[PDB]
Amino acid sequence: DFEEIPEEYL
Amino acid sequence: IVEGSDAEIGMSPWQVMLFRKSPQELLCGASLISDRWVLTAAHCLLYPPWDKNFTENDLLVRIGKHSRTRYERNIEKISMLEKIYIHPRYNWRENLDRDIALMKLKKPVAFSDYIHPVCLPDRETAASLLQAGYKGRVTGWGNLKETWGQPSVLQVVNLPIVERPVCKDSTRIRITDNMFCAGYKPDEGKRGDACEGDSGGPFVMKSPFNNRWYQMGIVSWGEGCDRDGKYGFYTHVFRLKKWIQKVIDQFGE
Amino acid sequence: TFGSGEADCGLRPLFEKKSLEDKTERELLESYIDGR
Ligand SMILES: CCOC(=O)N[C@H](Cc1ccccc1)C(=O)N1CCC[C@H]1C(=O)NNCCCCN
Ligand SMILES: *[C@@H]1O[C@H](CO)[C@@H](O)[C@H](O)C1NC(C)=O
Structure with missing residues (x-):
């Protein structure tokens, strides 16, 4: 249900 | 919540x-x-x-x-x-x-x-505020019910601190001095509690002396959510x- | 970071800093047997 977070963070 | x-x-x-x-x-x-x-x-x-x-x-x-x-x-x-x-x-x-x-x-x-x-309590702040009847505040994105939904936005609820003896008589778990309990009495006609997903969140209080918000507890444990005759247990930050x-x-x- | 928390600690930008109150803070204060 979580909206996609920026990849810089993964 | x-x-x-x-x-x-x-x-x-x-x-x-x-x-x-x-x-x-x-x-x-x-x-x-x-x-x-x-x-x-x-x-x-x-x-x-x-x-x-x-x-x-x-x-x-x-x-x-x-x-x-x-x-x-x-x-x-x-x-x-x-x-x-x-x-x-x-x-x-x-x-x-x-x-x-x-x-x-x-x-x-x-x-x-x-x-x-948020501020960490001092000895005197703890002493003054951590009293049965005093309300504190809990926040979180945890469930809205024990077995339901889930909030869209951050939730909030104010709960009263409870007398140690009432806390102890409500459970079979061994309570320590590193914990405190809070919540309304089945009697009180006011509910509320933390729930799944809220763990680890803050229990805070506002000092009437200096207007600052202090974190007195951390959401630790509880038997179900918002059960009558049950309370929430919090880690004693101070x-x-x-x-x-x-x-x-x-x-x- | 520590004792009494921070320095600017516990003072909210949108509330205490502007002298505004949140919708239920009164509740807490009244239980401390009425606030400051
Ligand atoms: C029907 C659900 O019952 C439980 O197991 N509760 C346990 C009680 C317990 C406490 C200490 C040791 C072992 C078990 C609990 O809260 N637990 C078990 C492990 C972590 C913690 C928890 O879920 N923590 N979250 C608390 C939020 C509850 C709001 N009412
Ligand atoms: C958690 O995982 C660790 C390393 O990434 C450990 O070294 C450690 O013992 C641990 N917890 C145990 C299983 O209780």
């Missing part, structure tokens, strides 16, 4: 979300105590009976949030963990005694209208302050 309400924007700017990288999910709540340190419950990270043993690299900390699921562009800040510290005497085998942990951010977060730290200082001083701040 069960029986709470939507928080106002910027109402708990120290509120932190503990976020699992993959799968992407809400793990627990937490709190911002400085520009580089986050406070949470040890059981959010380590709980062997459930095979739970999270690591730095497993998690993300999201600060300044309002919305539960949305990525709040230009508002929220996402940070990486440098080091996790669990209380050396946390008792996960029996009763969650000393349920506390510190997380050092990879880099300092910058404060804003939506991001700001009783553990010395360990906190110790870690922050020996390792950064």
